Amino acid sequence: PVAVQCGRLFDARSGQLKGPHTLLVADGRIRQVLPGARVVDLGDKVCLPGWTDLHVHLGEQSSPQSYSEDFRLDPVDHAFRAVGYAEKTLMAGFTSVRDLGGEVSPHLRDAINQG
Amino acid sequence: PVAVQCGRLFDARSGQLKGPHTLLVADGRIRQVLPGARVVDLGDKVCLPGWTDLHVHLGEQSSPQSYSEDFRLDPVDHAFRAVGYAEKTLMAGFTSVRDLGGEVSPHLRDAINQG
């Protein structure tokens, strides 16, 4: 049960920035948004929900050697690179993505969901 | 029957440069080498036998896009390029070549021999 302390809350539904707020997190879900249990301090930070990227290709990245690469590399190499690509995407603030092509993402999703 | 007039003859067998000479050409072969019939003047030129290149690949040429090209191009394109490559080779003084790899040269040789 971790209580997160935020100096400023962004209301996605309306589109306005509210004042200080306290979020109660339990069981992986948000329980209470009481304005104002381990404590997390973010007093000097603007609090926002996680971002979603509705168009990504986590199995690949463009390079000067991209086109010649489609006959030399196996999907295992693409998975080994997608590990780092997914970590980079998560650290940038995007907690969800929609992948729009490639047969490694269904396996990457299964691996991520299993921890 | 064309008589070629040469100011200086190179003797390949011995390796020395001789003096003026007259070659008699008939039936695609050399008949007489009399020292001295249509006449060809090369008085200011050193005459030498045709050259041979014992290692060529007339079906290809190296380029920055060479490796990515092995999955996109068909042998017909390679033949169309080998036409110009063979003309360039012949004009440089090489009347014979030994080709050491590629399945277009046996067809190029047949085409050249047929005229």
Question: H/E/C letters for each residue in B3-44?
Answer: EEEEEEEEECCCCEECCCEEEEEECCEEEECCECCEEEEEEE
CB A36 within 8 A of CB A5: yes
* Contact state of B67 with A68 under an 8 Å Cβ cutoff: yes
* Contact state of A71 with B67 under an 8 Å Cβ cutoff: no
Helix or strand run (H / E) with residue B83: helix B75-91
Helix or strand run (H / E) with residue B95: strand B94-99
Helices (H) and strands (E) in chain A, counts: 2, 7
Q: Find the residue in B nearest to A69 (Cα).
A: B68
Greatest CA span in chain B, whole angstroms? Answer: 59
What resolution in angstrom units was achieved for this structure? 2.7
Residues in a beta bridge with A6: A21, A42
Residues from chain A contacting residue B63 (CB–CB below 8 Å):
none
For residue B63, what are the contacts with CB-CB under 8 A and spacing of at least 6? B69
CB B19 within 8 A of CB B60: no
Residues in a beta bridge with A56: A99
The rounded distance, in Å, linking the Cα atoms of A12 and A17 is 9
The strand pair at B38-47 and B2-11 is best described as parallel
* Contact state of B67 with A67 under an 8 Å Cβ cutoff: no
How many other β-carbons are positioned within 10 Å of the β-carbon of residue B59?
19
Residues in a beta bridge with B21: B6, B35
CA–CA–CA angle B7, B11, B14 (5° rounding): 150
How many other β-carbons are positioned within 10 Å of the β-carbon of residue A51?
12
Residues of B with CB under 8 A from a CB of A: 67-68, 71
Residues in a beta bridge with A3: A24, A39
How far away is chain A from the Cα of B68, in angstroms, using its nearest Cα? 5
C-alpha torsion B91→B96→B98→B101, nearest 10: 40
User: Position of tokens 């509705």?
Assistant: A54
Mutate to test the interface with B, among A68, A71, A72, A73 (most CBs of B within 10 A): A68
How far away is chain B from the Cα of A101, in angstroms, using its nearest Cα? 23
In eight-state DSSP terms, residue A35 is: B
In this structure, what token pair is assigned to residue A66? 């991209």
* Contact state of A67 with B68 under an 8 Å Cβ cutoff: yes
Buried (b) or exposed (e) across B94-104, using 16+ Cβ within 10 A?
eeebebeebeb
**Shortest CA distance to B111 belongs to which of B77, B92, B83, B89?**
B83
- Strand boundaries in chain A, DSSP class E: 2-11, 16-17, 21-26, 29-32, 38-47, 51-56, 94-99
Q: Determined by which method? A: cryo-EM
Q: Find the residue in B nearest to A72 (Cα).
A: B68
The rounded distance, in Å, linking the Cα atoms of A67 and A73 is 11
In this structure, what token pair is assigned to residue B40? 């060809």
Positive or negative: CA dihedral A19, A20, A26, A32: negative
In this structure, what token pair is assigned to residue A101? 């092509």
The rounded distance, in Å, linking the Cα atoms of A82 and A88 is 10
For residue A80, what are the contacts with CB-CB under 8 A and spacing of at least 6? none
For residue B106, what are the contacts with CB-CB under 8 A and spacing of at least 6? none
Kindly list the distances between the CA atom of residue A47 and the CA atoms of A17, A88, A89, A114, B60, in Å, as whole numbers in the listed order. 9, 21, 19, 28, 62
For residue B2, what are the contacts with CB-CB under 8 A and spacing of at least 6? B25, B37, B38, B39, B40
| Residue A108: φ, ψ to 5° | -65, -40
The rounded distance, in Å, linking the Cα atoms of B25 and B2 is 5
Kindly list the distances between the CA atom of residue B10 and the CA atoms of B3, B21, B31, B95, in Å, as whole numbers in the listed order. 17, 10, 17, 17
